[PDB]
Amino acid sequence: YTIQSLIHLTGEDPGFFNVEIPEFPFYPTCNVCTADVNVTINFDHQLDLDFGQLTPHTKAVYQPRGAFGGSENATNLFLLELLGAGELALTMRSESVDVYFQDVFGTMWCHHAEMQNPVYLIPETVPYIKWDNCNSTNITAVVRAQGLDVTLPLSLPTSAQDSNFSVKTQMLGNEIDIECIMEDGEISQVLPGDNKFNITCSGYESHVPSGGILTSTSYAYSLRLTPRPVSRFLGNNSILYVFYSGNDYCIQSNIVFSDEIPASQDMPTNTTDITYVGDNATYSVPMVTSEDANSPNVTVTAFWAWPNNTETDFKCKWTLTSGTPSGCENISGAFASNRTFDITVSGLGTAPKTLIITRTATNATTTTHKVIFSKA
């Protein structure tokens, strides 16, 4: 399905970046979650790719990248390629990306996430630099999912009173050149702690906000940098450096990204519920807010609960622009005068049906109305 997005480069210009795409349809199958992925990445002509990766919620960092545009620099370096709720990063080598598919479960292909960064990047093979005058605390900068998270102690409490604190930092590794900066003026000890200074962190827009907090105490303080743009092109044993000035002292720590599976990737559920006494239970699908009263396409894919097998009598029909309304499933779907579908189940049953419907109208947010039928 088509969900356009706009992205602008921020801070410095690292070659690698993460383009979050939680917008495409995703279903809470809780069992078999096959998902065919096809990606197109433009550059400059357009070096279209043929990225293909079919991983359920069992392998979150797979990166099969059989290309067709030539020997491109890199694509979808996977360290958190699935980590998060629907987050599918597309990392490159340290650009008007047009993703095309997440799951099949029927016949509809589209996606989009436009980035205004350079179409073709530049190699950024950083020479090994150690910063001799930087005390290496060798703390473990574990990159949980994609966003970095550290609690390293700050540089020094030199001239704490009326200090134009600046926390400009940078992370280095396997040919990655990304440096963080601290925006919004110059923080000077506001409140006892949790200064919440916004961090540009370079990289990309970082839809989830990224910033560090200067947890001052009394006189030893700390620092809690949270730069989100951290991806797989880092080395397995790489080093980041933090430069905190006052009134310039640096600290070095070891960064190791983890390739693991997240808590969940499915789209957030509306968790709607209905109650029935008659087995011919029908549920009215609420109108999605982001879509007006008229739209050229809208689908109500009725999926069962805990499907141990592959797809079964589950209808993804009832679309607009001359769409087939005769659901091949065991169930039957209907609607009303207003565009609110009334979906009837295949006789339901004594057990809760817990059927899942993801009504994704065009240019509207996907609302997976996971409804758990309850008897009397």
Partner 1 sequence: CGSPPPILNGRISYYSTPIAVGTVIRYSCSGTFRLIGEKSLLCITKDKVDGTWDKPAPKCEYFNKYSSCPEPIVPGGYKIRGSTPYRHGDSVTFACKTGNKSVWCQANNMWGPTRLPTCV
Residue 374's SS3 state is strand
Q: What angle do CA 47, 73, 37 make, to 5 degrees?
A: 65
CB of 193 to ligand NAG, least distance (A): 14
CB of 129 to ligand NAG, least distance (A): 16
CB of 334 to partner 1, least distance (A): 51
CB of 281 to ligand NAG, least distance (A): 8
Does position 244 interact with partner 1 (CB under 8 A)? The reply is yes
- How many whole angstroms separate alpha carbon 69 and alpha carbon 57? 29
Positions in 157-216 near ligand NAG (CB under 6 A): 184, 196, 198
Only one residue has tokens 């990309």, namely: 204
Does position 347 interact with partner 1 (CB under 8 A)? The reply is no
Beta strand extents in 245-355 (DSSP E only): 249-257, 273-275, 282-284, 300-303, 332-334, 342-344
Positions in 272-331 near ligand NAG (CB under 6 A): 278-280
The CB-side HSE value for 108 (13 A sphere, CA atoms) comes to: 22
Residue 290 interface partner, choices partner 1, ligand NAG, none, CB cut-off 5-8 Å depending on type? none
Positions in 108-147 near partner 1 (CB under 8 A): 118, 122, 127-133
Stretch binding partner 1 (CB under 8 A), from 57-65, 160-168, 212-220, 253-261: 160-168
For the sheet with 367-370, list strands across it: 300-303, 356-359, 367-370
CB of 178 to ligand NAG, least distance (A): 15
In the complex, the residues that contact partner 1 under the rule CB under 8 A are: 8-9, 12-13, 118, 122, 127-133, 164-166, 168, 170, 183, 185-186, 243-246, 248, 250
In the complex, the residues that contact ligand NAG under the rule CB under 6 A are: 4, 79, 135, 156, 184, 196, 198, 232, 234, 236, 256-259, 278-280, 336, 338, 340, 344, 362-363
